[PDB]
Amino acid sequence: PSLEDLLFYTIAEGQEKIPVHKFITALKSTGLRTSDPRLKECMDMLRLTLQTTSDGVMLDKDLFKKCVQSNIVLLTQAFRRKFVIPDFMSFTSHIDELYESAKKQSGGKVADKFSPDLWGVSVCTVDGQRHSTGDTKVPFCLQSCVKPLKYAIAVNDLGTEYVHRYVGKEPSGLRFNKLFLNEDDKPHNPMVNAGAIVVTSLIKQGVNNAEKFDYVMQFLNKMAGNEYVGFSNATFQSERESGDRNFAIGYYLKEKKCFPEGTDMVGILDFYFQLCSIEVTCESASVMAATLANGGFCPITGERVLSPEAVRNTLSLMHSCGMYDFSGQFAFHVGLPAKSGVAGGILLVVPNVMGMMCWSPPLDKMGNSVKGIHFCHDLVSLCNFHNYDNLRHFAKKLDPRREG
Amino acid sequence: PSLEDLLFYTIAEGQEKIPVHKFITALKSTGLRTSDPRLKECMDMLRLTLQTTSDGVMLDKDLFKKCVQSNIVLLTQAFRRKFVIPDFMSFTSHIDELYESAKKQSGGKVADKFSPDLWGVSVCTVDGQRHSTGDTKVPFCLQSCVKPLKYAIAVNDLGTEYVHRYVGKEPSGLRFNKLFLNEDDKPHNPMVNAGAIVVTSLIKQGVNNAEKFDYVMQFLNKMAGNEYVGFSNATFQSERESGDRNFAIGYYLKEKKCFPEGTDMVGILDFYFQLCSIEVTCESASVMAATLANGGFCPITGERVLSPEAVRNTLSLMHSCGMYDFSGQFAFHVGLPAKSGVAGGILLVVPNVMGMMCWSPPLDKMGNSVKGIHFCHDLVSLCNFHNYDNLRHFAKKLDPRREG
Amino acid sequence: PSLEDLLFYTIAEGQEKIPVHKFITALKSTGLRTSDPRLKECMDMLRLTLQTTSDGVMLDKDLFKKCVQSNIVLLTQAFRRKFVIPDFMSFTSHIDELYESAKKQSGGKVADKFSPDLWGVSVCTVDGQRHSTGDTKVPFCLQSCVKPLKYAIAVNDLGTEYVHRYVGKEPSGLRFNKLFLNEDDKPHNPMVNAGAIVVTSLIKQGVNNAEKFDYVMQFLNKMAGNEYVGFSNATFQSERESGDRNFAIGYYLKEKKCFPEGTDMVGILDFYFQLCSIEVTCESASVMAATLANGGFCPITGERVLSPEAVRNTLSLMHSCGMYDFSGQFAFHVGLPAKSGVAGGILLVVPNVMGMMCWSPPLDKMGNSVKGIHFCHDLVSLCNFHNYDNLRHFAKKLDPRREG
Amino acid sequence: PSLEDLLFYTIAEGQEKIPVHKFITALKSTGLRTSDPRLKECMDMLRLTLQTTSDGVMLDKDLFKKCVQSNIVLLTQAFRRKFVIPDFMSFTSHIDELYESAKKQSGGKVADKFSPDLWGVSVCTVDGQRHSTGDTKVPFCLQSCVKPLKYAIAVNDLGTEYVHRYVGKEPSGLRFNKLFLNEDDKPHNPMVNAGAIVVTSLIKQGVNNAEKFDYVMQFLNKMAGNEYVGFSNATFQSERESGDRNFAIGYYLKEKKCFPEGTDMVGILDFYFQLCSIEVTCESASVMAATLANGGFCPITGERVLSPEAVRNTLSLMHSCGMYDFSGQFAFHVGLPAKSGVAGGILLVVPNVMGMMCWSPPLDKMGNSVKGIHFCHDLVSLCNFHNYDNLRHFAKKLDPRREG
Ligand SMILES: O=C(Cc1ccccc1)Nc1nnc(NC2CCN(c3nnc(NC(=O)Cc4ccccc4)s3)CC2)s1
Ligand SMILES: O=C(Cc1ccccc1)Nc1nnc(NC2CCN(c3nnc(NC(=O)Cc4ccccc4)s3)CC2)s1
């Protein structure tokens, strides 16, 4: 028995000692990055023993074991390739190829502000492995990408039954999106502005709007492994000064008695416009994506955020309702819960595998980003990620969950 | 190396002989039934050597070794619990459990002539394991349960592009449950009578309703591993006596030129009413369902009935379009590709696991077996088969893909 | 006392005699044609006394009088200007102008078979007065101009109450061009093919379709004062081999139990196809209009064809449901109960004044004669015939019911 | 020649003087009211000459002459029975008969605060004749009865075509009591809250909401010959707190840029609710009804309030878009342009005859006054007033424009 030192020999070719860069690149290549929270101890003790000399440094089998003792369990499976993507290093080189192939899709137009050449993809597997290519550190607002996230919080806190005494669950229709309420005098489902507004009103009833936004922020922090979540006051005041269509939905719901008892209607939209201006980066948000890919458990902190009840329902509804009018075709050709917003954002989710976020600000005639859409077609072109692809017989596709 | 030897003292607890019945009881336990067609070489050579006596009797390691030499490769994984559901024997206790609960469900009306207290459930898994409780050998007609099966057949010959020149992919909306076409003047999706009637028009073009029907009985024969795929001539006389509405759908489609050039609209309804009266049993139809579970390869034969393109698209559309108006709620609360039929049938698929078929002739108001539906809420309640359940963190549900 | 003498001097120069050519042109100017059936006795007894002489003839006080005694009261009204239009002579010169400017309206496609330059108008007041300009004696088919007339027959024989157990009375709304039934499973109104078809099932249930057609033709004779009503077997069967849309409606109404029991659905369609192919001309159909403009009484025979009950409902429903999708605009700018026909027909009715029929085969985007459409707009642009024009304060429009 | 003399010998029995209190009942016989404003000079000059006595007393040929010298032209017609309804005395009994038969229908509920047994009916003919039985002097609010009047004021100022850039001219469809705009992003007609609100947005554009109201209040007073057109500030303060539905409409309208340039969406709604709060009595409002029966001229004054273009369009749209969802059924069985509101009122117009107002506060289940609705059926069953009743042959109904 000797678990920590079995990885020393695995990195030290039956050898004297190893430099630390040789451990660092043999850890940067496992997908993981030196920044993983679950890796903090081990990474701390390397910041320590590097200052031990001004040497290499170079690690003993006991000096090594002293840093990796802490996180040894998720360290072995990284170097014993027990991650849901074993060969993470090649699978990035196609993400880069799918990125540059999609880089030339020129058509589209922004809404009305960013510059129309920006284009980033970022990836986070249900285990931690990360990759980014292109402009993945530039912030943008979620906008409607938040609609799944706040729906989860709501059923997380209330339960399916209560949450669905006020909103329905099926998709609208392709020329039935102009309506607000369904036959039961409830909104169609929580991915349309009509039902997203009734769900924004169930979140912590009895408390006020300053406090409520914190509560969401602390949920959304947990889902993103405490990576970047921000807030444009800018796009907030634009959102509440052009949201005429949204005030419309507001008053209709007040009269048809669709809000819970004693809901300051105007308080609730004010909140909603805030929620849409929350900022993220590509990298920030792929973690949020991967929290849903992972049953309500953040992949880079192991902290459980979302009841599974909540994760199931949010994914069922991103499937049918998440691309606006394109979701029926999306759920057909790509067949992945996804959620686009008008920023260029697609909160792609590959259940039990990984999580993504794409960003090109040029949008198409339906409200989806041009390069964003194209990408997902080429991604499920290549690998058997479509929800009803077979994991055993998948013809000429590539399953990154296997090796060789 | 001794692969046929490896299994001898795996059934023979270090003993020298094995009673044949102790081996086959060790095989009935695997779920497989002694009549598997990938097992017949082994079964033929078993009855050969067992008439080389008539006393007991037993098999030595030299004798067992050329019975099961034939189909060792899958006889190994049967006995090495390398099948999708390893402890198949306790899973069936729950299928019995939920069966006997759904028996007490008394409501529903029979359509119109069967007896109301009929009720049977049958499983076949992606590897071939079978179970059947209750009345699962009485035969009924698929009715609309045929509508996915023909859709696949079209795409496996014509391709996804051509076939969706002629029938959309979205679901309609409980408001559009009695419009026929969509904005682009195609029917909404192949699971509604209007869409059925147009896919039937694309099969085996240039050929008459005799060879056409036979080419769909043969194809359905492949899918079911050559189990009972029959035909009621009785139904097809009165489905055409009282099919006033379907003549309504057919002429409207002809008016709008929804068929490929040169389609006998009256004959295609004839073909269609035929396909609706193909008989199956619970038992035979669960192999059809499991064939789609399994990448288009028939589990109990090994042959490749369907291209993977075609099994994928059938499963996409069953999900969203498969349960008349209950589709919306079914994809929420049960989240499985299912399909319902006016006679009590539910052709249920659990992709990459298994394939079911339930049957109780009393429907509810919406057209789905009362006992049928009840059962499928309970099956997802107990087990993590919901399409968007999590395969690692699934709360207190039972995963049958696991041991322990 | 001597009313027949009063006419003698009122036409003669207070002189001599009367020449007869100046009696008939004194009569042709009052509107009436020598053909009027209320004038045959008069017309007869002059066709006699002019086989007497071989020169003039000129009638004396006594000879004049015995021709006109039998229709003295009708013939006094013409020359004492007690007709609904007194100065018919000038009213027609405007009809020619309105027909002339409408001559040069360019576009339009004829449906598919005639010639695109055909154009005639014909008019007949509630009192018998007739005018026609252009191609007014070429036969064409009513097509959907027939739907009011058979509605009239049905309610006249069965009553408002019974009839409207099977068809509704409101219009549909412009998005509902494509539905067949209102919410109560009844076709919206009797001017859409679905309600028409149901009207024709009520017309003398229980008698065969050879006898049924005779009845209608008899009724359609009583309405044209026994002028030209024909039937082209040529369009009747081209309307049969292309009526795909109508068989659609047929079966839908069969299935929804929208006919009286005993109705042979397919028979009723042939009846309907028959009626659509009835031939009329501009001239002969302007009298049928005038029968309805006249409270049930044919204006050239004084017979009571239709109960008033039946005449009221037909003009109600023509008003709102009469011009396909254009009825809303037509009922606004024109405001006369009309009914268009794909042949080029418009069956106009100015109640208590006159009936007309226009014909040019070029139709517009909505299926309504191009020159036909333009003419009405102009005619009501010039006379205060709009249903909600005032008869006292009508600004700059011309009232033909008043002299000077 | 003896203009004024002629009517002295008419009322006095070839006798000396005529007692004045019987000339006044000779004039109350004619339906006219001694307070008729076209009769003030006659009534003043008459007040003089009886205080030039304190006698009985009576009137000579020359004392009668310089009293009615003034308004002889309508005093002659009032006694020569040249009014629209010659035997007004008998007519009023059937108004009482139809009144107290409508008084026993106990059905209905008020909305919310009045008393359910208020029942008031008031008639004004296009000549000025008046009658009023029951609670015809109790004030209530126009409510939607405002929409026609508001529409006319619009079109009389800006003309058909401008006003119909911002509102169409068709009814809805019983299903589309719900949608706001139509296929051209305009509200349907101006008789539903959607178009009423936009119509409001075109009265005196640019001027603020204080002059706007006083502009339509000076316009309603003209239309009612300066009888009681009040304003309940009470209901307005409530109509503005429960008007959630109307706020929904307004915001949606701002979204689709359906108002004209520079419209303050929120002041326009305030204006609207004011327009609904305007007060009238049965008697006050029955004179507005008559002003539209009279091509835009107030009967009891004689001024030209509305362009004829403006009152034709208004009467068109009340015909069809008049009584909410009953309007089609109303336009069938009653076929009279009418407008109902939530207060218990029906604004009835009988073109070229009279105008009316009914009032029972109990509405039925469609927003229309119960005793009101009953009365109007009774009245067209009684009299030939129906839009498409024939004026010559009208079977067993009564005609009040003919004597006997
Ligand atoms: O008009 C157009 C353009 C258009 C129209 C037609 C064709 C093509 C183009 N766009 C529109 N923008 N906003 C519109 N109105 C919404 C719908 C009405 N209200 C309602 N929302 N949901 C109801 N639903 C039930 O009230 C319950 C129910 C639904 C269906 C069936 C039965 C019951 S109303 C809320 C507002 S419309
Ligand atoms: O519904 C009721 C009674 C009802 C109504 C309301 C409430 C409750 C009860 N009866 C009916 N059952 N079926 C009806 N329609 C027929 C079948 C489908 N139709 C059509 N097929 N495709 C269209 N669509 C485009 O042709 C393209 C298009 C789509 C949307 C908008 C514009 C254009 S209609 C053609 C006729 S009617």
Residue numbers in the entry:
A (entry chain D), B (entry chain B), C (entry chain A), D (entry chain C): 137 to 248, 255 to 546
Q: What's written in the study?
A:
Cancer cells often overexpress glutaminase enzymes, in particular glutaminase C (GAC), which resides in the mitochondria and catalyzes the hydrolysis of glutamine to glutamate. Glutamate is then either used to fuel the TCA cycle via its conversion to α-ketoglutarate by glutamate dehydrogenase or as a building block for various biomolecules. Numerous GAC inhibitors have been reported, with the most heavily investigated being a class of compounds derived from the small molecule bis-2-(5-phenylacetamido-1,3,4-thiadiazol-2-yl)ethyl sulfide (BPTES). These compounds bind at the dimer/dimer interface of the GAC tetramer, which is near the so-called activation loop (Gly315 to Glu325), effectively trapping the tetrameric enzyme in an inactive conformation.
The serial room temperature crystal structure that was solved for the GAC-UPGL00004 complex was largely similar to the corresponding high-pressure cryo-cooled structure, with the two inhibitor molecules bound to the GAC tetramer exhibiting the same cup-shaped orientation routinely observed in the cryo-cooled structure for this complex. By contrast, both molecules of UPGL00004 bound to GAC in the room temperature X-ray structures adopted the more typical cup-shaped orientation within the binding site. This supports the idea that UPGL00004 is held rigidly in the allosteric binding site of GAC, whereas BPTES, even when bound to the enzyme, has a significant degree of conformational flexibility. In this case, the ring-to-ring distance is 18.5 Å, which is significantly larger than the distances between the rings in either the cryo-cooled structure (14.4 Å) or for the UPGL0004 molecule (14.6 Å in the cryo-cooled structure and 14.7 Å in the room-temperature structure).
